Amino acid sequence: SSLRDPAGIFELVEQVYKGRHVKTGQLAAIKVMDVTEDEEEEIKLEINMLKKYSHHRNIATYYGAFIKKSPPGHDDQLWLVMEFCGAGSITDLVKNTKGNTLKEDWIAYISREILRGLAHLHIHHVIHRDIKGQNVLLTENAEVKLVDFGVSAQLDRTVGRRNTFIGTPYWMAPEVIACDENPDATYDYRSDLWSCGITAIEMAEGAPPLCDMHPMRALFLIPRNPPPRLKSKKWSKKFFSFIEGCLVKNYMQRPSTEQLLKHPFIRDQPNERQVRIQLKDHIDRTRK
Template identity: 55%
Template sequence: MFPQSGKSIVFDNFPDPTDTWEIIETIGKGTYGKVYKVLNKLDGSKAAVKILDPIHDIDEEIEAEYNILKALSDHANVVKFYGMYYKKDVKCGDQLWLVLELCNGGSVTDLAKGMLKRGDRMDEAIIAYILHEALMGLQHLHINKTIHRDVKGNNILLTTQGGIKLVDFGVSAQLTNTRLRRNTSVGTPFWMAPEVIACEQQLDSTYDARCDVWSLGITAIELGDGDPPLSDLHPMRALFKIPR
C-alpha cells in the first residue's frame, strides 16, 4: 500500500477514479507506472492516466510531480492536468491515478523514427517548430523555478492539432530562493548535461536550469538522426564520454 500521506498531501483525500474514469487501453509507460487511455463516464471525453505502482519509496517523486502539474500545467506547451485520484485495492495494492491531457499524436521520437523507417528525414522547419514550442514550455518551468531534468524526444508529445506538450515530471526539481542549484544526478544518460553527470563523481558539483537546454539540444540531434549522440554505446560508457 501507499503511505497514507506524503510530506504535505494526504492520498486518502483524493476521490476514487472508478466513479469518473474507465480504462480503455494501454498507451505507454512513464517514469513510474503505466499510462492508459481513459473515458470520462460523465461527459464522454477522453484523457490519459498515469497509474502509479504501489511502491513505498516514490512518494516524494509522486508529490513533486503532483505539485508541478497542479501549479504549472496552465501553459500551452505543458500537458494539462485534470486531477489526482486514489484507488484502494487490498488485493493488488493501492493506486494513485494522475489524469492528464490525451496527446494522440504520440512522441516526437516516434515521429522521427517513423519517418526514417520510410527513408525520409524530419524537415528542419518541423524540428525548429518542435524545439521552439518545447523551449516555450521550458521557459515557463524555469521562470517558475522548476527544472524538468529528463528532456528527450519521448517526453515531448504531439496533439492531433499539432500542439507540442512537455510531459513526465517524475524526476523534475523545484528550486527555492535559498536553493537555486541542484546536486542530484538524474535523467536519461544520452541526454544528460555534463554538469549533471559530474554530480555522480564530484560531491561539490551543482547544476541549474541550463541542463534542460543541453538536453533539448541533444533532442534536436535525435530528431534529425533518429537517435541521440553516443547511442551505440552502453549507457554507462556514454556517461564517461559526454563530459569529455
C-alpha cells in the same frame, strides 16, 4: 493537491494507458504505478511540495494523482492523469519518417515549441528534468506539448521499483552526472536547454549522440567529451549555431530559454504556417 480515489473523476479504458474523464467524456492519458503504504505516504508529502503554474498550449496539462485502492493483499495502484495527446511522440514521428531524419524547418518548429513550454516552466521556477523526443507529444492537430505528470515534484520518478534506477543517460546534461570535479549532481534550469539541443540532434539523426555506446560508457563520456556535434555538414549555419548555443559544456556559460528563443534558427521561421500544415498532413497519413 490531494491524493484521492479515481472513482467518478477519472476512469481507465483497458507505463501509460489510455483513459477518460467521466463528466464530459474528455480523453485522458493515465500513468499507472504500483505503490506500497510507505510509497503512498511519500507521495502525500511530495504533493504538498508541488509548485503552482497555469495551463499552457505547449505543455500537456497535469491533472492530478489518484490512488486506485485495489487489490486487497497485493500492492495498490497510483494513477497520474495528464492531457491526452493523439499523434504520439517526436521519437515516434522520427521513427515513422522516410530517412529517420526531419526537415530543418520541422526541427526549428518543434524546438521553438519545446523552448516555449520550457520558458513557461522556468519562470515558475520548475525544471522539467527529462526533455527528450519521447516526452514531447503531438495532439490530433500539429500541437507540440511537453509531457507533465507532476514534474514540479517528479511524481512519476520518485516512487515505484524503477525509482532507484539511474535511467537513460543520453540526454543528461554534463552537470546532472556526478563525476570527478562534479561531486554534486546539480539539476539547473539550463540543464533542460542542453537536453533540447540533444533532442534537436535526435530529430536530425533519428537517435541522440553516443547511442552506439553501452549506457554506462555514455554516462562516463557525456561530462568529458567536448560538446556533441551534428554528423552531417548539409545543415545550415543557423542549425550548427543553435546546437552550439544549447550544448555549452559549462551550464554557468549556457544561455537561458529566453536567449535561445531569440536565436535566429528559432526566431526566423518564415514557413511557420506551411510547416504546421505538412505536420498535420503527416499525422493524417499515419492514422491510416
